[PDB]
Symmetry: C3
Subunit: 112 residues, 3 copies
């Protein structure tokens, strides 16, 4: 099993969510975060202006899925989140050591 | 050492926090997130209604602990967070490569 | 490549950001979180008072960088975030399995 983190433009959240539901994902956690970096019209992190602000609101999606559906998840996220413009974001994949269901105390095989 | 992420129902935060303090945990970071998925009365992610909203507020707890107390932490989280109902959440465990104390620049043995 | 998570005192965010820009970091995601734990004037998590609150606002920074610049990033974070007082926070480093650019569908070598 793997944890997939995706930092996307907020307006694409519903499309990504709909598409991920189609592939069979049953749970997703979403965090609102501030992104600093790649932005149209700018060339730098830290402009350090007095009244201007350098951040852009972003949405971080986290799903934990079986190894075999990782590529299907990655492919569907890119397809539904990509605009071809600056700031589309990135997908990071991480190995998970254990996955425990709180309701029953039962573990999922973290190697699937 | 391992990083433990737990996504729990918000009302259980104080109980989980109290119980974790008893076992000796001295620090915890908490993020408010939106959960999509398993919910009483529903059968799907993405209902895509115009006025209804599909998310439920959740609380994500992150602690970084020694390998030997991971099971004690997992067991105490389940005990204090479990309701036996839909949406209790999950616990994910991740390996940590390095842990650095900012105040002193000193590292903890990430293998403990 | 590695993922660096740093939990810092909010007022140090701009300094850390400026310094990280100097070393060449081009993107950073920031989450506002609540920290429980090490605090001046206190000796415990969970005081469970009726009107008092036990949390302190914190800022979590997440950057994903090449293995060779991890120490440079860690060193610059400590330098710019350290106050020498209680509550300076910690830096955790995690291995990343894959890094995918959403705009182009192109992967970065996660082993660099």
């Amino acid at each position: 099993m793997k944890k997939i983190d995706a930092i996307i433009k907020p307006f694409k959240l519903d499309d990504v969510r709909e598409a991920l539901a189609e592939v069979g994902i049953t749970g997703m956690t979403v965090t609102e975060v501030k992104g600093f970096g790649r932005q149209k019209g700018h060339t730098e992190l830290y402009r350090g202006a007095e009244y201007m602000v350098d951040f852009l609101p972003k949405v971080k999606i986290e799903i934990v899925v079986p190894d075999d559906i990782v590529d299907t998840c990655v492919d569907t996220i890119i397809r539904t989140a990509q605009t071809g413009k600056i700031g589309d974001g990135k997908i990071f994949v991480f190995d998970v050591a254990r996955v425990i269901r709180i309701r029953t105390g039962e573990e999922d095989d973290a190697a699937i």
